[model samples]
Target: SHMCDAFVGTWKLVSSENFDDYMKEVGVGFATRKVAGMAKPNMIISVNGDVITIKSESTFKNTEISFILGQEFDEVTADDRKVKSTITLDGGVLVHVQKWDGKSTTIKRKREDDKLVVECVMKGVTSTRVYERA
Candidate 1:
């Protein structure tokens, strides 16, 4: 089976839970947290050969990253944290791990039924955001 094929489409945010607390755990400032909390960003995932690109777009801001699986790269996250990020496939789940300032977080993206489910974790806090195909 082709693993990357499942995510090659536009996805609209449907629901988010505990995202603010997760952001706080990652040292996001109040102003940035507030703006990020209110945003419902769309995620666009595409694949070409061994490189994969994921883009997040919203009225507030837009960000995109392209990388090959298992390769580490510099990434400026939505909250403006410059971190070393790596994406790899684990049992068909897209696992992204980011490290910055001696701290780290993990984001797992998977497709369930017809929805794209994302789970974010930092320290002890966890957040989940679901998206629907657009």
Candidate 2:
């Protein structure tokens, strides 16, 4: 099986599951959540050596984050949540850790078929957000 290095590209969000609960925990407004739930987010990732930058773009907001592999650092989330994070590669899976801030969230990225599969896990919520080539 091939690893997830194929994730370095532009992706268009096709759909999102459990995003509402995740946003709610981040203190996002109901109206904003409603619109965000239906919004198609675009993602772009670039890796330079052990540092990687991930950008999530939407009509409402654009979020960009950078992290070094296996090193923890404070990060301000797209929702304005301050947290610590690190990136690690486990075999074929790329795991991103956003420290336990009421929610133990981990983002896993891998390739599935012709698309990139992003699985986000938090406290009582688990969401799968799929993205395809743009």
Candidate 3:
């Protein structure tokens, strides 16, 4: 059984809603945002002791971020933004926060019905991306 491990495998994106809007709010450029909007990425998650690692793989660009729960660190995103990030896990859900230039965004990842649901929020907009196990 995969009990007690809701996010320890690879997942492929099934659908994304309002992701372009979320990227715009994050100040991504027009060209970048458009390209990103059309991309379907795969997510690979793993845990080692106290550190958790998540990687994004796409035909355009690939990125990975690793952190210990509740600790804040500097991160350079796939979009090339330098930001401060923190992630905490609760009840198999991961809450991630990113801050840059006085702006902040939150991304929550949770497992539901053998799928991964990611909610990305910025100022006044929210996006949802669904992923299925791969």
Candidate 4:
């Protein structure tokens, strides 16, 4: 019942593991990336009955994604790359996969003890970002 309770809120980026590499992985065919443009990001996620909405606010660019679990939708990367994405459950981890430009990316989001954990893999490079509730 409270599953959505934990995720429907605002969060701010606290620490990023391998911050530099992640930027490059998400860049590749760049010159149009946005997340990499933010440096740090703030996220707002809302889960309403099954429809999940994710809004990311960066320095000067913002991205919003919406989808229903298990359904496939087109999602854009921070740099504005369009990818075929699907929200699914992977062994208790909320996982999403993105396929685009002949490349693929994966993301997982979960709530830990007192922090929100986000893992992103684009072009095979992994970036881990921890967020705190705000």
Model 1 — which ten-residue stretch has the worst lDDT? 1-10
> Sorted by TM-score, highest first, which candidate order results?
1, 3, 2, 4
TM-score of 2: 0.84
Q: Judged by TM-score relative to the true structure, which candidate is superior, 3 or 4? A: 3
TM-score of 3: 0.94
lDDT of 2 by residue, 5-124 (tens): 687889999977788887776566888788778778889987777667889898867888877768888877666678888888887678988874465578898888998988887766
lDDT by residue for model 1 over 51-87, one digit each (tens)? 8999999977899999999999999998889999999
| RMSD in angstroms between candidate 2 and the native structure over all alpha carbons | 2.7
Write one digit per residue (lDDT tens) for candidate 3, span 58-116. 98799999898899998998789999999987777899999999999999999899899
Stronger candidate by lDDT (1 vs 3): 1
Inter-residue clash pairs, candidate 1:
none
Q: Model 1, residue 20: displacement in angstroms?
A: 0.6
lDDT values for all models: 0.94, 0.79, 0.89, 0.77
lDDT of 4 by residue, 86-124 (tens): 987665567988887687778898889878899988766
Model 1, which residues run further than 4 Å from truth? Answer: none
lDDT of 4: 0.77
Candidate achieving higher TM-score, 2 or 3? 3
